[PDB]
Amino acid sequence: LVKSGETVVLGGLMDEQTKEEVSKVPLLGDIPVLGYLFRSTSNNTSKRNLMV
Amino acid sequence: AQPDVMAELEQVVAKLDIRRAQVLVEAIIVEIADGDGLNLGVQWANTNGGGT
């Protein structure tokens, strides 16, 4: 129930997803900088902001 | 109905027609996932002695 002039929110979904994967060599993959040479990282992120 | 009931129905209606209040409901679903597999294994095969 909305006032005769006013634009309002019915509903909405703000959805956020982040998947992170690494295939690394156990000890070597964890060397804080060099380690990125052993690891094959796959990262993913998403955002959806829906407003009605 | 009788004018007696008309006045009684008139209060029922007035109470029953009250501006029903609105509710904005935000849900927040947060999930976090990960884990570490490790497979390290060493095999020695010798023609003379034996294999593992």
Give keywords:
part of a larger assembly; 2 chains; 52 residues; mainly beta; two-stranded antiparallel sheet; 2 strands; 0% helix; rod-shaped; Secretin ExeD (chain B)
Topology readout:
The structure is cut from a larger assembly and holds two copies of chain A (52 residues).
Chain A lengths: L11 E12 L16 E12 L1
Antiparallel strand pairs in A: 1-2
Q: What can you tell me about this protein's structure?
A:
Chain A: This is Secretin ExeD. This is part of a larger assembly, with two copies of chain A (52 residues). Chain A has 52 residues and is mainly β. Chain A is 0% helix and 46% strand. Chain A has no helices and two strands. In chain A, strands 1-2 form a two-stranded antiparallel ribbon. Chain A starts with 11 loop residues before the first strand and ends with a strand. Chains A and B meet through loops of A and loops of B.
Briefly, what is this?
The structure is cut from a larger assembly and holds two copies of chain A (52 residues). Chain A is 0% helix and 46% strand. The first copy, chain A, is built from no helices and two strands.
Task: Give helix % range of chain A.
Answer: under 10%
What is the oligomeric state here?
part of a larger assembly
Structural class of chain A: mainly beta
- The radius of gyration of chain A is 22 Å
Order of helices and strands of chain A: EE
Query: Count of DSSP E strands of chain A?
Result: 2
Q: Per the principal axes of the C-alpha atoms, what is the gross shape of chain A?
A: rod-shaped
Instruction: Please count the helical segments of chain A.
Output: 0
Query: What percentage of amino acids of chain A are in beta strands?
Result: over 45%
Biggest sheet strand order of chain A reads: 1-2
Between the first and last Cα atoms of chain A, what is the distance in angstroms?
Answer: 14 Å
Largest interface: A-B, 4 and 7 residues
**Biggest sheet layout of chain A:** 2 strands, antiparallel
